[PDB]
Structures are given as C-alpha cells and as structure tokens.
C-alpha cells in the first residue's frame, strides 16, 4: 500500500476562568518537532478531571477557517475521569499545513464556570491526538 | 515440569511534583531479601487514587537499557481507584540480575501535574509485581 | 438436620496512622454477650470509605496461632464504598473458644498511608461477621 | 486472584545405617533464606538410587505434632532411579511457622538395611519440595 | 495403594443420673491394646435401649481441645432400640495420639433425666467405633 | 455390615545360603502384638532386590498343615526391584490361630543360589502382609 | 489501545565496486529528524535495478551487535526492477537507540561484481523502511 | 527459502567431584573448526550413565550473560542410560559469536555427589548439540 506514516501524541493542561486554550502545531511533540510538514488528524483522546464543578468545550478548527464548525459539546467533570472522543467526518477533514506558519490554531478548549466571575477549581485535562502524516519529502539529489 | 518458583509482591507509595520514583530490586520484599538471585517479571497490578487531579506514568525498563521502551501511558485519578496492568510481550522480556548491583532500576513512575510548578495533591498509588524466579542454586557439596 | 444456630453481626470503626485494630470475641454483640461459647466463622462483609487516599488490610487469624496465614490484601478507598469478602476454606477454618479468655484476637485490620508519618484522613470502615455457633449446652439436671 | 507466591526447591543427600535424616526449614534455600516466614507444602519430588540393596521411608510431619501421621512406605532402590511423590490431603495440611524456631523438623527419612548392623551401600537420594508461601508482609510505614 | 489398616470395635455400658461417661483410648480393645499408636476415627455405631424414659447425648472431642465442638443431640429411648451415627467431616477430623497419655478422652456420653434428681431407669447403650490406624512402625534394624 | 477390621503390615529381611526363613505370627507387629487373636490372610506384597544373581521362593502354609501346598515359584532378582503377589483362593484360605502357640509358621522363604555351596550376594527382600482380623472379644462383664 | 505511532520512509542510492553502504539513523528523514528517540523496525521495501549485471546483499544489524545475523541473500538485477522484503522475527527484533550516538549502523548493503576488480554498471537501488516509534516523551512540567 | 545451513555434533566426557565442565565453541568440531562464525543453538541430546550414584546439572548460558538463566535440573543415573533434552524458547535464544573470543562458555555441567567430599564413580556423559549457522560470508571480490 502507498500508506503513509501515522502518529499518536498526548498533551495535558489546566483550564482557566475566562479563557480559551489553543493547541497549535507546536503543542504536539512529533508534529512540532519537524516544523515543516503536512499533517491531518482523525480522532481524539480526551480525558478530564475537576476538583470541583467545571465545564469544557473542545472546538475543532478546519484549515483556513475563520471560525470552528464542530462542537465537542459542553461537558462536566467531577472526580471520576470523563472521556470524550471527537472524530471529524468527510468535509470537516481538510489538511493542515503548519510549515509556513510558526503559529497556527488546530484545536482548542474554552473553559467555563456557572457562577459569574468565579475562578475554576483546580483541574487537569489531557488530550491525545491521532495524526496522519504525508511522507517526508525524500531528498531528490 | 522443570517449572520454577513464581512470586507475587505488593508495594505502595506517594508521588511527587517534579520527580520520578524508582522501584528497584530492593523495593520488593521477596526479591530484595535474597540479594543474589535472577528474576524476571511478567505482569503488574497498579492501583491509583488521588485526592485531587493528578497524573502518573509507569515506564518499564529492560535489563541493561539506557532508556525505557514501553509506556503505561499518562493516567488520571480522582477518588475512585483506577487500575492498570502492564505486561511485556516477547522481546520486552529480558532477564534482570540484581545480584551484582546493590542498586538497579526495574520500573518507575514519574508523577505529573497540569498547572506549572504546583504541588501534587495528597495521593497514594500501590503497585504489585508478579515475578518469575530461577531456581535457588542448590549447593553442590 | 442436626444443624446448629447460625449468626450475623455488624461492627464499624475508624482506622489509625501507625496501628492495627483488633476485633475480639467481645467486638461482636451476639458472640460477646454469652461470654462462654464455642463459635466459628465462615464469611465476611467488609465495606470501606475514606475521605482521602487510605489503605487497609484485614488479616484473619486462626485459633491458637502465633501469626495470621491469610490476607485480604492491601485496599484503597475513595468516596465510593468498596466491599471485599473474606471466606476461609477448609484448613483455615479451625474453631475458636473465647470462653476461657476474656481477650482473644479473631480478625484485625492494620491501616496504612503511603506518605511517611502522615495522619489518616477521616474514614469509616464497617465489617460484618457471619458466625456458626455450637448448641447452647442444654442444662443437664 | 488473591493468590500468593508459590515455590519449588530441590535437595540431595546420603542415607546412613542407623539413622534418620531431618530436612528442616533451613534445608531448603528459598525457605531457609528468609528465616521469618510462613510456608506450607503440597507435593514432593523424591528420586532415589542405591549402589546396592537399600531401603528408605520418608515420614512427613505436621506442625506442632509429636509424631508423624503419614508414611511414604518402605522403598528399595537398585541402579535405576525410583521416584515417589508424597502429597498430603486436607487435614494433613497444617501450616508451618519456622520464624520463631531456628530448628524445626518438616520431613525426614530414616534409612534401612535388612542385614543386622551392616553399613548402607553408597547411595544418593534427592528430594524436591513444592512450597506455598504467604505474602511477604508489606512494610506498613 | 499406600492405604493403611482400618479397624472396628464395639463397647457397651450403663448410663447414670448426674454423670458423663468417658470412652478413652483404653475403652476400645484393639486401640487400647497397643498402648502406643496413632489412630483416627471416622464413623460410629450407637444403639440405645431404656427400660423407661431416659436421654443421652454423645459429645465428640477433637484432639488437644478443651471442649467438644460437635453434638449427637439429645435422644430418647423406649423399648425399641434406637441407632444414631456420628461422623465427623473435614476439620472435626484431627488425629489422636494416646501413646504419651495413659488417659485421654475421645468421646463420651452425659446421661439425662427430665425429673429433677431422679435416678435413671435401668438401661444399656452400646457404641461401636470405626478407627483408622497409621502403620505399625516397622522396626528399623 | 458385620464386616471386621482389616490390617496391613510390612517386614524386611536378608536371605541366606542354605536356609529357609520363617515369618511367624510374631513377625508382623500388629498381629504379634495382641498375642491372642484369630487372623487370616488374603494377599501379599513381595518386593525383592539382589546385588548379584540370587533366587527365592515364598512357600505359603495353611493352618495345621505338615507341608505347604502353594508356590510363589522360583524368582531372580538383579538390581531393579521385582514384585510378586501371592493370593490364596478358596480352600487355601483356612484360618490361623496363634493364640495357643508362641511359635507358628505362616509363610516363609527358602533362598537359593545356582553355584554349589556358594554364598548369597548381599540382598534385601521386603514382604508386606494383608491380614483380616476377627473382632476383639468384647469383654462380657 | 496503548498503540504507538508507526512510520514509513524511503531512500535511494547507488552501489559501488568494493564497498558496503551504511543506512544509519540519519539516513531516514523522520527518524533522523528527531535525533533523540527510540525506534524499531519491522519490514522493508527493497527495489533494485541495474544497467548491467550486478549483485547486492542487504545485511541487517541488531542493536549492540558486532556483526550481522541475517542475510537478504545475494541478488541480481537486470532491467526489470526486483523487489525483496526483509522482515525480522522475534529475537532479531531488538530495539535501537540512536539518541546517544550521532552515528549508528542499522542496515547496509555491500555491492558485488563477478569479474575481479571491475566497476559496477550504473544502477540505482531504493530501500524503504517501516519503523515503529515509542511515544514522544510528553514533557512533564 | 532464505534458510541457512543447520548442524549436528556430539561430544562425550567424564564428570568430576568438585567441578563444573565447560563446553565452549571449540568443544564442537564443526563450530570450532571455522573459528570465525556466528551460530545459535536450539536443542540438545544428553545421555548419561554412572557406575554408581552420581548427579549432574546442565546449565545453559545466553550470550553476554554473567550468569545462566536456565536449568536442566538435578539428575541421577544408574546403569541404564538417561536422556534429557534442553531446548530454549524465545528469549533464551540469543545469538553467540565466538569469532572474537578464543574462549567462550556456551553450556556446561557441574557434577555432584551426595556424600561430602567423596569422589565421583566412574561415569560417562555424552551431549550432542544441534546448531543453526548463519551463511558463510561469500567473499565479495
């Protein structure tokens, strides 16, 4: 098969009170490492855990798009860890090119708390990304 | 059968903020006791529990290896206890000899917290090891 | 059938930092009440709950034995209650006689915390015992 | 399973004219090594060989028993090696504790020759023991 | 089979008003005869007959036990003979050694009459014992 | 069943050049012990072993018989042990009474060597006897 | 699954008259890029083409091995392209670590011509490597 | 098939009282002959015979290992010849290279006698080795 190399990477972070957190090409070790490659993503590992009531939403972004077209949906947490997977279907699948941009926004998560202007309980969310990579350009003498 | 003696031992510990914790030959009562024997391990009992959001990864090490080749994978906790088993397959199975070294690193667990430079909530993880032992050299007059 | 009377009793307690807790003949209302009877135990109801990470082990003791021969095994807790049953099989079944001893140690639980010299979170464990009793000696005129 | 560690050890010796030979806790490397542990035995490997007519009997001893209750039975030898296995059934199974006694007699073999006061031909008998061990007491902080 | 010799013996006696009657090693011809042997019992033949209303209870005793753990149960009689068999199951089966004690109490029967301080009608009870014997130690030159 | 007690005993000895060896009531521990009992035998365990070429024949004797009527048959030995069983059928079964005779000849073995007037190589033969015993006369007040 | 990222890379080269050509960690774009990672290889794509009669042999090397233990076997070419795959089986599978060595020899190909000291016809061979990679160490705060 | 040449060789020797006997690359004609080749072994032919009681144990050694990880197990002999085969399974299979070392220890046998400091009866043991050989490096012009 003319099948290419496939990849899996994980990342972990803390949410915040009034902000969205961006996972860029550079947030994923393997992808960020090369700095000049074409990649695409198919599915996601998302595990969450909150010390106290807290919500999150992982908006996925398509290449060259002003705004996101897909929603993980608002989630809660609690002690027990909660896992949600987000997989795009044909058409929400366009290719990303982070070779020309030092900074690009793939996927990100806005946080959220019900009580107005109140700080988010200590919590940790870990998201793992499954990427498909186009062949490393073999150097052509 | 020329089958040898098999063994099971348990151990419990607390994680830390910026550190990896090593379980050496001496961390397991039965194994550590003899001080001069050849052993091998097949499977593991790993139970975890955190008072608040906390992560762990149990890297397994092969004999005479500079770096580990296998990953339990990043985990979360929460109140409820979480159990993960790590079993090596052929080739990740080499034999250990702690007879010549007072200190040897079998398996260990790095801890981890999402929030930069923040201390790990009180938590306890207990790992149980299933070891296979070569016959006690019968003294030969 | 020459079947005798069978009994069921429950008891609840708190663990401690550096200590084992003994459940004696007198810890069980029905058994302790008579003060002069022969009893035997077959199975156990053990429910646990910890406010924060904490471990326990219920060692079972056989009659006229210096040391215990069976292990419930190290356990964790968390909010959700955890239940473990310990049932002895032939040979771990010998009869107890608390008639001649004011104090006798049937079963007990050592507590345990991972962090060196740290106090146990508030927690409550309840153990229920299923006992078999020999006939009340009918008074013989 | 709450299954414990199981063990296998071998030992070899020469018989004598008017004497019984005792295999104590210390006769078995693994068992003798710890010096403070509870063990039990289930089955035995017994191979024999005599340069000339000679008999043996392996009496098995139960814990805290003045005299043995089971008999391998008188055996002969000859060149060809002869193997007999002795396995106790429920009730002949009590647990041994060699932790408090430096010297304890588990199993032993009296030798025997038909001709009055005549020395035993050169011969070697090897007995292998299959032991079940209770968990190494995990140190409890 | 390494099967040993098995034995059957019978004995007969009269009950009494305020007393228990003990059947010791010496109460059974075959067993009492040797005076230095290890025996065990499996089942019993117990036939009774009373000239007038009278009760009996055959308590069975285990080796090295302060008190009995099993009860034939209170019985009546009448003219017709009544037979009851008492067979111990695993655990109520321990071995007896009457070699070191001139007097040892195996099984016994307390008598009993309903009417306070009244004498027992003339009556005869016969109990037969089925014993298992360990091999006669073959003299070892 | 009105079934009586059955018994099993073993004995070992050395053969000789020009002689027959007699196993009398007193040669069997259990039987010899009582000194006043009626017994009968059904089958035999006969194991042999010779350091060098040697023959044996176990003639069985019936009660009150001048001469034996049955023949084990001439046997050889060699290193490997050889076992032969001799079981009498109806009519070769008469009962023995050693109560009135201090010395009585049950079964015996003549030895034998091919070379005229030459001594028998060192060798040991062990014969085990299976006896049926009539009830111990219960003492009759 | 705890399945890791897998990779595929291709490379092309010219053979020589009296020499072996080494493909090191740095010969494969993806692998060479990171410069500090653990990888393993399972199967190979090897296509060859010679302008005139020429032979090649791809010896595979195991980690920390003085000499190669496996042989693609001598091959010929001709115009038509010839493809051979080399896949190691358990035991020829050890892991490679090129993190500590700038230069390491994975696999290589010696060339070969039948005619003594004659130059190799112009020819091109392309080998593609299928590698398995251990997770990128997630940075642990 | 790219199948290589396989080999079979035999060797015979005498044991000793207090010593282990080493079979090195040079102990096997075919293997020793080349002096510069890579070989591996799969199974063994081991026949033994002792004039009098004697024991042996064939410990197998893996490449670049301080100590052996597998045990043939203690054996007896006697006149009749006894044969035991030792075959390593994946992981106990590493390759040997005796090309760089004049002397290397593959497999060896310690002898053994039950009676303290007593000499071993005359005896002969013959071991046959089944080896797998990597291709003879075809000279490459």
């Amino acid at each position: 098969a003319a099948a290419t190399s496939l990849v899996y990477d994980t990342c972990y972070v803390t949410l915040t009170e009034r902000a969205t957190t961006s996972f860029q090409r550079q947030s994923f070790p393997t992808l960020k490492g090369m700095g000049d490659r074409a990649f695409q993503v198919v599915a996601f590992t998302i595990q969450g855990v909150s010390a106290a009531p807290l919500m999150y939403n992982a908006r996925l972004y398509n290449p060259g798009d002003t705004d996101s077209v897909h929603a993980t949906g608002v989630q809660l947490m609690g002690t027990v860890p909660r896992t949600v997977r987000l997989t795009p279907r044909v058409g929400q699948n366009n290719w990303f090119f982070g070779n020309t941009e030092e900074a690009e926004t793939i996927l990100a998560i806005d946080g959220l708390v019900s009580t107005k202007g109140a700080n988010a309980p200590s919590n940790t969310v870990i998201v793992t990304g499954c990427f498909r990579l186009a062949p490393s350009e073999l150097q052509s003498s």
Side-chain angles (χ1 to χ4, degrees), chain A residues 37 72 123:
Chain A
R37 178 186 294 278
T72 184
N123 68 357

Side-chain angles (χ1 to χ4, degrees), chain A residues 81-136:
Chain A
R82 293 300 293 292
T83 58
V84 182
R85 67 173 64 196
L86 186 58
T87 309
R89 58 165 75 215
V90 177
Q92 312 170 303
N93 244 338
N94 297 331
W95 241 293
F96 288 99
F97 292 100
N99 58 355
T100 60
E101 291 309 309
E102 298 298 4
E104 185 58 8
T105 295
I106 321 163
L107 184 149
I109 300 175
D110 315 357
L112 177 52
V113 174
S114 57
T115 328
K116 188 173 290 183
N119 283 166
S122 296
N123 68 357
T124 302
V125 180
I126 73 87
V127 175
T128 301
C130 183
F131 308 95
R132 187 176 289 99
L133 318 180
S136 59

Side-chain angles (χ1 to χ4, degrees), chain A residues 49-64:
Chain A
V49 176
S50 64
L54 185 152
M55 304 176 73
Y56 81 75
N57 186 335
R59 335 179 56 210
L60 173 62
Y61 295 91
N62 185 61

Side-chain angles (χ1 to χ4, degrees), chain A residues 36-37 134-140:
Chain A
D36 180 0
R37 178 186 294 278
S136 59
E137 179 177 11
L138 177 63
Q139 299 181 322
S140 183

